[PDB]
Amino acid sequence: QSALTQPASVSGSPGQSITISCTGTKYDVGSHDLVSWYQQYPGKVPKYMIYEVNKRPSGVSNRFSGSKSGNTASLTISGLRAEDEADYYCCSFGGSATVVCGGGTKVTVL
Amino acid sequence: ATVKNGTVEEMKNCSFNTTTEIRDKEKKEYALFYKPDIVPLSETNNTSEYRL
Amino acid sequence: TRPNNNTRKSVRIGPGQTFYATGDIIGDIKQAHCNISEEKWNDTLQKVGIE
């Protein structure tokens, strides 16, 4: 299966802003802006932090933000600290009436 | 009207024999029609037989 | 609108000429409906009553 394109890992230092990237076809990422982002501590459930490419749910800190340009997207995090150490996933509107998700990106705060 | 399970209340799934362009190789085909365009063929209890 | 993601199907009926029908439906089933803003409609019917 396709399951989008997503990098294996990201690097950074505290204080820097980073992006978590996802890229796919124009149907899956670009035909509709329905892009959501999910986050996974090791051994925990995936957690809900970004919906409709750039909006935030109940109680989520406003440091996190989304972005999209054409057929790519990136969860933009301003001001890293060590608490962001987790795995990250993107999901988006699939081909026909489905949802498709990426391959996982590990946050490595050096 | 099992579209994706359930029942779509407006559209019936019907199948019919099409006299093809060769006219001696007629084949089965299927289409979805609206219930204003579909009439029961007879008043008897053969209620799986319909007409335009 | 018609909020029902329909799909066109092509059938060949006789020599050379075709016919178009409704094939599968993708996505969930939704009701066809039309919308009018309520305050403008009540204003319009009250002005029609005025006239």
């Epitope: 749910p57 988006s92 509107f93 699939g94 949802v99 | 994706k4 359930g6 | 909020p3 969930d28």
Partner: nanobody, 126 residues
Framework: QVQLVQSGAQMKNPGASVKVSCAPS????????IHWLRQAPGQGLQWMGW????????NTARNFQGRVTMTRDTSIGTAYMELRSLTSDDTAIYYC????????????????????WGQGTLLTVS
């Protein structure tokens, strides 16, 4: 807010088929779309299907055709997953999520807004 619960554990063998439950708590079950997703150990997240509990309609991924089927409950209210023709590679965690809001005037199935997550279950097949 609200919370879903799922089955405790599923250790199985190939060719046996698997049922997973998903009982909601805090909100009316026949209000939101219910999605089902799969996560392998050390592999990215897989989306498996969605189902409308109001109407009983459901759709799955194109790779999961025939293997994955789902039903609903009205008396108590829960979501039933049954996995068919499975092999050892389906040893994974299985998640039941609450999707978008059901309205009769526009489609809201493919919204990936998994607002509430269950605790999932483990399927171990070897």
């Amino acid at each position: 807010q609200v919370q879903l619960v799922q089955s405790g554990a599923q250790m199985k063998n190939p060719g046996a088929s698997v049922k997973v439950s998903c009982a909601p708590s805090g909100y009316t079950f026949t209000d939101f779309y219910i999605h089902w997703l799969r996560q392998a150990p050390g592999q990215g997240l897989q989306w498996m299907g969605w189902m409308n509990p109001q109407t009983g309609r459901t759709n799955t991924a194109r790779n999961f055709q025939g293997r994955v089927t789902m039903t609903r409950d009205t008396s108590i209210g829960t979501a039933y997953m049954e996995l068919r023709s499975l092999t050892s590679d389906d040893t994974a965690i299985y998640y039941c999520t609450t999707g978008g809001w059901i309205s009769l005037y526009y489609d809201s199935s493919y919204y990936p807004n998994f607002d509430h997550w269950g605790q999932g279950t483990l399927l171990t097949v070897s």
